[PDB]
Amino acid sequence: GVTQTPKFQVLKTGQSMTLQCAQDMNHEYMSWYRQDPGMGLRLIHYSVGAGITDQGEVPNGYNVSRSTTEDFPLRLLSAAPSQTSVYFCASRPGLQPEQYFGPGTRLTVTEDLKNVFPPEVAVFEPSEAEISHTQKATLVCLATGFYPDHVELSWWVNGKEVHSGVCTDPQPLKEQPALNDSRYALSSRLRVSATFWQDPRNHFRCQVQFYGLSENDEWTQDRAKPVTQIVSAEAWGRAD
Amino acid sequence: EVEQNSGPLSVPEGAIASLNCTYSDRGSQSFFWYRQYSGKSPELIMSIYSNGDKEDGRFTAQLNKASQYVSLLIRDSQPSDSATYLCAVTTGKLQFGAGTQVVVTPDIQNPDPAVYQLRDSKSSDKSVCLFTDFDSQTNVSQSKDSDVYITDKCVLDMRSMDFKSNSAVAWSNKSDFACANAFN
């Protein structure tokens, strides 16, 4: 189907960037949209086939290239804060226009890379009171202190990703809602039976994948360089 | 111009979510509804071309070229339908509306509203407060305080028990912080 690289990217104002879009469906038509809170999808550029590209509603600041039928890269010439957004590549056979969308690229443009921070992650074990009232056991994962808002939180029980009994906040809280580059927090809950939580051989891990700086960004600060990394926390079941 | 009704719209589980969309250009040929889950990509769920009704599963799309609106009804709404729905119109170049968020709240069968305090599995010094098992009419208000954080409510589905529940989580740095303060 349609694939996009990277999923997330932070930039310093001025830096340039290339978002990749690929589609091995021999589709001839390809588009890039940006999506902004409260605006929906806005067309940036599009291409009817190889060698051909045309502008859309908001073409300014971006170039494209369609050399082949498979790829439609989008290039950001010079990052500005106003280009913080989620970009989606989309394709259709071309020649009844169902559009298929890539999974999207979320981009954050910041004044200074010193603003970048990885999350700290902790798992909070279930209340005994909950256990005795409800016979169910809720664990909470909290990811705190991170910037930009580029995380994916997952739960893993005995080594396998779980989706049932989970719910993660659909958006981060700003830790300083007034501050422009505020750091963020995100919580998730995983709820299992009391009996399952009570088995000491059962393992519960909250994984947060953070997208941050790469090997090649400068770092002089007192703290570890905030690179793309996985930060995780766990708990073992306990009869209690 | 593509204009959709303003959200988020709350819909009790089982009811009808009803979305609409006006387009300015009367010579538009093709009409679409996309579903977008939070953090995810738009997915085409309905195409409509001629005046009238079109059905697929629990979806009913309707086009009234006369009045220049398209609508989308989701029947017997389920919590898993919570999403943003976008209207797109063709002139096959697409113009997209700003989308309407729908929130389908669960019918909580046996509410048992309660606040519990949970401790860190590592340090044991740190905790969070969890408000859970309240009914979907229940209001969770923001903190009366910049050092106390309170999430929006979140719906979780334990398919292993056919059991859904609402929850919201709070926490703070200020010690002598009690769950007792947190939800008010």
Author numbering:
A (entry chain B): 3 to 63, 65 to 98, 102 to 103, 105 to 116, 116A, 117 to 246
B (entry chain A): 2 to 58, 61 to 93, 98, 102 to 194
List passages from the publication reporting this PDB structure:
Using this technique, we have generated several high affinity TCRs derived from the αβ TCR A6 (A6wt) that are specific for the HTLV-111–19 peptide, presented by HLA-A∗0201 (A2-Tax). In contrast, the engineered high affinity A6c134 TCR bound to A2-Tax with an affinity of 4 nM (nearly 1000 times greater than the A6wt TCR, or ΔΔG° = −3.96 kcal/mol) and an off-rate (t1/2) of 3900 s (>400 times longer than the A6wt TCR), as determined by surface plasmon resonance (SPR).
We next solved the structure of the A6c134 TCR at 2 Å. The crystallographic R/Rfree factors were 23.4 and 29.5%, consistent with the expected ratio range. Superposition of the free and the bound A6c134 TCR showed that, although the overall conformation of the TCR was virtually identical, the CDR loops underwent substantial movements. The CDR3 loops of both chains of the A6c134 TCR were poorly ordered and could not be fully resolved, indicating a large amount flexibility in this region of the TCR. Although the apex of the CDR3 loops could not be accurately located, the portions of the CDR3α and CDR3β loops that were visible underwent large hinge movements of ∼5.9 and ∼4.6 Å, respectively. These changes were substantial compared to other structural studies in which the largest loop movement observed for a human MHCI restricted TCR was 5.6 Å. Interestingly, a nearly identical observation was made for A6wt TCR, for which the dynamics of the CDR3 loops were shown to have a large influence on the specificity and cross-reactivity of the TCR. This occurrence with A6c134 leads to the somewhat counterintuitive conclusion that substitution of the sequence AGGR with MSAQ in CDR3β does not greatly impact the overall dynamics of the loop, and leads us to suggest that the enhanced affinity of A6c134 was not attributable to “preorganization” of CDR3β, i.e., the MSAQ mutation did not alter the non-bound form of the A6c134 TCR to a conformation closer to that of the bound form. The CDR1 and CDR2 loops underwent a smaller rigid body shift and hinge movements of 2.5–4 Å. Altogether, this degree of conformational plasticity is high compared to other TCRs, and demonstrated that the A6c134 TCR undergoes a high degree of conformational melding during binding, as does the A6wt TCR.
